[PDB]
Swiss-Prot record:
The chain crosses the membrane at residues 15-35. The gene is TREM2. It comes from the Eukaryota. Monomer. After ectodomain shedding, the extracellular domain oligomerizes, which is enhanced and stabilized by binding of phosphatidylserine. Interacts with TYROBP/DAP12. Interaction with TYROBP is required for stabilization of the TREM2 C-terminal fragment (TREM2-CTF) which is produced by proteolytic processing. Interacts with PLXNA1 (via TIG domains); the interaction mediates SEMA6D binding and signaling through TYROBP. It is linked to Polycystic lipomembranous osteodysplasia with sclerosing leukoencephalopathy 2: An autosomal recessive disease characterized by presenile frontal dementia with leukoencephalopathy and basal ganglia calcification. In most cases the disorder first manifests in early adulthood as pain and swelling in ankles and feet, followed by bone fractures. Neurologic symptoms manifest in the fourth decade of life as a frontal lobe syndrome with loss of judgment, euphoria, and disinhibition. Progressive decline in other cognitive domains begins to develop at about the same time. Expressed in the brain, specifically in microglia and in the fusiform gyrus (at protein level). Expressed on macrophages and dendritic cells but not on granulocytes or monocytes. In the CNS strongest expression seen in the basal ganglia, corpus callosum, medulla oblongata and spinal cord. This is Triggering receptor expressed on myeloid cells 2. Undergoes ectodomain shedding through proteolytic cleavage by ADAM10 and ADAM17 to produce a transmembrane segment, the TREM2 C-terminal fragment (TREM2-CTF), which is subsequently cleaved by gamma-secretase. Forms a receptor signaling complex with TYROBP which mediates signaling and cell activation following ligand binding. Acts as a receptor for amyloid-beta protein 42, a cleavage product of the amyloid-beta precursor protein APP, and mediates its uptake and degradation by microglia. Binding to amyloid-beta 42 mediates microglial activation, proliferation, migration, apoptosis and expression of pro-inflammatory cytokines, such as IL6R and CCL3, and the anti-inflammatory cytokine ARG1.
Length: 46
């Protein structure tokens, strides 16, 4: 008896997913650039 799993989500939803995406890429990107620069910006060793 777990009716909580058989209920449909309210028809609104998709816009919420878009908000998640903006949060996601914003983190994964900013952290990465901050790292490589913090060691050396534009490293040489060509």
């Amino acid at each position: 008896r777990s009716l909580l799993e058989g209920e449909i989500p309210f028809p609104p939803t998709s816009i919420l997913l878009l908000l998640a995406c903006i949060f996601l890429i914003k983190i994964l990107a900013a952290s990465a650039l901050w790292a490589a620069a913090w060691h050396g910006q534009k490293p040489g060793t060509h």
